[PDB]
Amino acid sequence: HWGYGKHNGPEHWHKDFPIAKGERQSPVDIDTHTAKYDPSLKPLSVSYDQATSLRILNNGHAFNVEFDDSQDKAVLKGGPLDGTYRLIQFHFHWGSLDGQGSEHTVDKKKYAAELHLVHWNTKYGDFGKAVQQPDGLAVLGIFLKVGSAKPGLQKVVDVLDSIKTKGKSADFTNFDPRGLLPESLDYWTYPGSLTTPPLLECVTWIVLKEPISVSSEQVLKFRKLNFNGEGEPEELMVDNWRPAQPLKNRQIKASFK
Ligand SMILES: [Zn+2]
């Protein structure tokens, strides 16, 4: 099955998912000299006040916090978007050391981790239908750097010991994803793809310029997770990031210079 290792990782994915070599693959390196400041780009609107988290799960590739997307309120809109998108889940990618782990890079710089908040377009009925459309998803990508602790992340870090292996999950109600956002919503944006198989080219990417700071203690907890199931040989969940893919003449636009 696909994964992140030497024999099933990103260099192999094209054999089962030929779109891996397509025209709008993600992530990408954000070259700040070639990105284009667009003064017409509006502020992002992130409205998480009524977000209803349900559960946290280790799916064997990352851990996901799932949300009740049956109603509005928990919505991403504005910015480069022409529709409204409902939050369905978030997850992270991270490294085997603080010096790598992000999927997007900025002038080739890698962050320790990257948070993906995944939202689907309300034109399309549900997530599964939305991913079949070029504008089906809007993913808010947020870099993590190591520094002070992020208080809003602590509940997440604290629960990870209970979901160590693939197929484990825990109750995870009453979590407020507003605690994962940086102060500034300045962003880069470009059209791209899921960064995991099936790699569908259905995403408007919105990557925040400002990282959030998390502590070394917090990020170390990510690295205790396992790719394997319970009872199987230990395979530590680290380096679950796809490297940057060719931009292929897409334009990355910025809400700032
Ligand atoms: Zn992701």
Curated annotation (Swiss-Prot):
One of the GO biological process terms: positive regulation of cellular pH reduction
Mutagenesis or variant effect for H61G: Impaired activity, not rescued by 4-methylimidazole (4-MI)
Keyword Acetylation belongs to the record: yes
Modified residues (Phosphoserine): S162, S169
Pfam family, one: Carb_anhydrase
Effect seen on changing L194A: Reduced CO(2) hydrase activity
Family per record: Belongs to the alpha-carbonic anhydrase family.
Annotated protein name in UniProt: Carbonic anhydrase 2
Originating organism: Homo sapiens (Human)
Source organism phylogeny: Eukaryota, Metazoa, Chordata, Craniata, Vertebrata
